[model samples]
Target chain A: KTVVVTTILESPYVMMKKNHEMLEGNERYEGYCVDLAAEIAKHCGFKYKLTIVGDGKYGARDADTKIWNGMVGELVYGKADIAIAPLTITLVREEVIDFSKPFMSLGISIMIKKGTPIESAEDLSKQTEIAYGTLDSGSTKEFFRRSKIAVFDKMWTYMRSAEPSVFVRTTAEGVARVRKSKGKYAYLLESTMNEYIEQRKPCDTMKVGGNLDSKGYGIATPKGSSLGNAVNLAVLKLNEQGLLDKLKNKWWYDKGEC
Target chain B: KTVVVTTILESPYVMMKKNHEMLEGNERYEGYCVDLAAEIAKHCGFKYKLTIVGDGKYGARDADTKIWNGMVGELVYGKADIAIAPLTITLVREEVIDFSKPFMSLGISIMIKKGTPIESAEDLSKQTEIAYGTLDSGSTKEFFRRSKIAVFDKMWTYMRSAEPSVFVRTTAEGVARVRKSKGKYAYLLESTMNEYIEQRKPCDTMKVGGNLDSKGYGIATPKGSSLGNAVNLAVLKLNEQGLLDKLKNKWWYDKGEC
Candidate 1:
């Protein structure tokens, strides 16, 4: 069967190439996820169509409507067979879709401007010298909302009702805020994205302290789909053969600017 | 036979108890290593005597003397049946003694005083504005000495010849220099120690940048000791059961001050 893969446009993961204007269909994109989609399709013995999520969000359920949105929404609603971007696996998301074993491990990490006095979440929570936040409507933001841990809950309370919005609309906007805030603002995001940006030029931002929580990004498929099993096994096989590490190097360190 | 376990006195790893005046033998000390020693012995079905290494070093060979020092030497000479501490597993030490799979993972990391301009080795290597170094004669020092990677090798050359003596006799001294030097000095040490210290009082220092290299600390035994296999299996079992993570939380986080 031809598989429908829904992903999002995210740097280093999936993005329209510089010459995307000259390409068509899947050929229009190139990145870790694009390469990963090809590998998974080859290993699973299926033809696949890569589609970008209509809404440029990782995925979240609306409180009022209780409906999933973004790439996750596509899978839950059966509009796409799979999701292959930097989408995180959460218990809430798993209720609606099956995630392949994590293709990549990461955690919610703290991003700080160079020379920030903040060293940890505790540090940020204890004082008002600096303000910190996560990208809105993302797993990181959801983590704080649902967290029961004392420190994280306290942080979430502060972030949930801060005077000005601590949440950012996008990763690029968050990075730009950290760069422009002069060490007064901190961004919390997936470590992979934070590390990728750290290696790029004008490297004024860096991931600081240990991660707040540990999790991974998985190739997500619609619940109970036969393709889920094949994709899971394929991810495990690729991980065992070290192809995942090779791909990470190809996209992260091999092309590093710093 | 009561196994003689050689260890070292390092903060939060193995240390003299605050009430040592009223305690005896192994009870006279307590730490992460102390707790680990107890766990390993219980699992391996052995009674072990914990003895601190006479020399304070983590373990290194002297160029002129051609003799290993620290707990590593204790194992090689058959003076100790096992060695449990934050003693890093290195190729040179591995050749002389068997290191069970690492009970604790760590890597060489950068330690900076608050507001230091340096973010990475690349940053430090590119500028002489801030003096940086590793704890003298430790695994971190040896890493720079033996590294073939261009950035690290270049750093090693700079540190090897720097006139003001960037090296310090101990992790304490290195951290002290960073705190005292304002923004002028940065220290390189194992991330475990770095993170642990960063959580302590004053909390003026932070671990900046990703690890320079990845490695671990293992329970060491004589080259072919019978206990080696049992100990290795015990570590893997502990890791699987999440006891290792619990132990880390007990030592590094539960008591964290900042």
Candidate 2:
């Protein structure tokens, strides 16, 4: 039986094949997360099916809506056995899920429409004209909401008041807004995702603002999945061989964005 | 004649005397750059006055006003004989003036209210609501502006037309904005300044982002100043004697935020 691995259609991670009719799940697959998942599966000896998340939001508490999205939630609900997306290893998410060794390291960062005048994250707090928000259930939004520093506190004030439209529900939607808005809207997401999208075809948006915090990206699994240890070791092995870096460069630099 | 060296008041760098009238210039000074400046002046056999920059904008080519400000400007127009602040050596400013050997190294970094959601520089390029900007006319800002890589190119876009305000004019203004803005504003400043302030009393902000780029601070003098050789050699001497790191620890850890 194939392991149902939860994933997403976020570009460079997992995306729909333009010619899905010509492909099989085990053959002719591509993308950052898919490639990583395949490598882990080969090293750990598992067969898998990549099931895309139904919604865009990464898993979160959602104090109001109280639902989660992305692979973390899928794992929590037993909808999938593992996840290979750019899923952030955050505190709350860590509580509900188990993760393999970090295959990649990243932090929360922002993106602005090309030609927006802003230069760094701190610039957002001092002014009001350019509004800021983060993906609904993603770690970047949570970071600002919980931060104690002065600027983050100020940003939280603005984000809380920001309209629902101002906050994107998924990374893809955020990228779309950045492309259409023409430097008006700014999006905050993971650095890996940011660099990945910047390399996608028809690339119009770009990453800006240095990182706001630090965290690593781990291959997520439901608590105590039997494949966890094998997958973790696989990641470590890949890292040791410099294969992971080479893969990242292939997807994020050569095939994606640097 | 007392040579007035212009600078900005920052934690562990320069601070207003609690009782300005009661302290001598030497007595009033306490911090890395503060002590470094005094030591360099003493070694070079020059009497100097540390005057704060009036406009607070780090040196920049302002399209609107067509004038420069900060310590760099002070030296450019003969407003001050030399500058011994944590001023970074940048290419744009290099065309108009000269700089000594680097006294210290630092890179642009992000600071957010503790708990903010963001992490790395790449995240900024992926968001819409979390707007970012850079310090105007400074080395950090120029790095993004001059970079040819995809990340830097995308960043330059957001910075150039930052929808509301584009960048902070000076390091002090950016820090003040960070402090006042709650968690909403994440400021990007030099790592040295961030670390200096991080160890201070009422430590309101913490550096969250890693060094996005690398460069160093140089003792700046107008082109062809006779003091360049003496100032550069003195910096080397002080560095070799461990005074630089010692003073850094003293100001940052012991004296607290000036």
Candidate 3:
């Protein structure tokens, strides 16, 4: 049986075929998870389809309705057999699907408008004067929702009660929010995304935060899926061969956070 | 009502009251957690008393006996209001108690003899030729146990089935195992502790692996405690005041692994 995998169009993980029509699985797109999926296929002796999730947003809870969003829904409905994107393994997500051993690690890093005064995640977490919000339904937003330690729990209380316009629907929206908010608003996201966006044009933002918590991205599957066993073996093989690092550097580092 | 609190005598958190004969509550020992506890008390509006856990090791499970060997026992026993030491929050612990937001984040780092053939956590995950293990019942060991990812899950299988003698009782025992085993055995522990022990007199070990996973140390309390609200709030207050970072650097960094 073919595994239906769900991923996103994040740069480096799945580079679009500039010549869109001339692409096949191994040739057109290549990134960390791409290499990972290929290795998984090889190890598990199976074939799979890689369909990018429609919404390019990290999974999170909608403030208005408190319902879940992102690729989580894709899995909930069986549109995919596995999620191999940089989908963060979080308490909220864990409640639904199962995550494989995390292949990557990250934390909620803040993106501040350049020339802003923030220095660390703690700086934002500590401040009451400057209001902040994360991409709705993203890991950063959920971290605040699920965290019981430190100032984040208090921060969540404020975000949940803030004005509707205060929450950004996407990273692009959050970035725009910070750009126009004049240092009064901060955007929280994975450090990977923050570092990637910092180097791009409209270069008015900077990342400042020493990681609020530690977590990793996992290959998620529905509970009790047999494919999980083989997929996991593939990850170990790639890790052992140093292919994971090579892919990460090829996509994330060399391409400059696409 | 007084907040039930359980803690241990770890340096820079709880120290012997140099002038205990002369001081009162919160005035005896001096360290980061000492100050932290006081501030939390002020903000949460609760009176707290610190008591030592019967056992001193950072909680563990005795594989042979399947018994909790750390503060986890106290939490399950309903004696303390909360556990607020350098206590790590693990999945196993979460099954029984609720953790406040993590006060600190750490990783399960690999401590190996400097010239060992292994270079990364990935390296260990790939092969059976090299033997390595984490302190039995600690965070590092738990990382393997709870992992669903590819390589780690395999490693977990190896660890669980390895000769029972592979298990260790304390960080010291694990460190000694690595030192005396002459590169044959590797020890896994928290990054902070691994780095600290790496710098001692013999200084024969170095941390390998780019961290298998990210974790946080939480203020653990019973599943249903009235102090939960206050305790979580105090954590935020301390984080906002920059006291948490100050405490971490004091114990972890000033001691040199910042």
Please, what is the whole-model Cα lDDT of each candidate in the order they appear? 0.83, 0.72, 0.72
lDDT of 3 by residue, B69-154 (tens): 66877777666767878786555566577666566666778899878899887888787766888876655675577666678888
Compared to the true structure, candidate 2 yields what TM-score? 0.49
Point out the worst 10-residue segment of candidate 3 chain B by lDDT. Answer: B233-242
TM-score of chain B of each: 0.96, 0.79, 0.76
Per-residue error (Å), model 1, residue B140 = 1.7
The estimated TM-scores of all candidates read 0.56, 0.49, 0.53
DockQ of 3: 0.06
Q: What is the lDDT of residue A139 in candidate 2?
A: 61
Model 1 clash tally, residue pairs: 0
> Just chain B of model 2: what TM-score?
0.79
RMSD score of candidate 3 (Å): 10.8
Indicate the worst ten consecutive residues by lDDT in candidate 2 chain B: B236-245
Preferred candidate (DockQ higher): 1 or 3: 3
Error of 1 at B26 (Å): 1.4
Better of 1 and 3 by lDDT: 1
Q: What are the runs in model 3 whose C-alpha is more than 4 Å off?
A: A22-28, A54-70, A125-131, A157-165, A179-185, A202-204, B1-190, B195-258
> By the DockQ metric, which is better: model 2 or model 3?
3
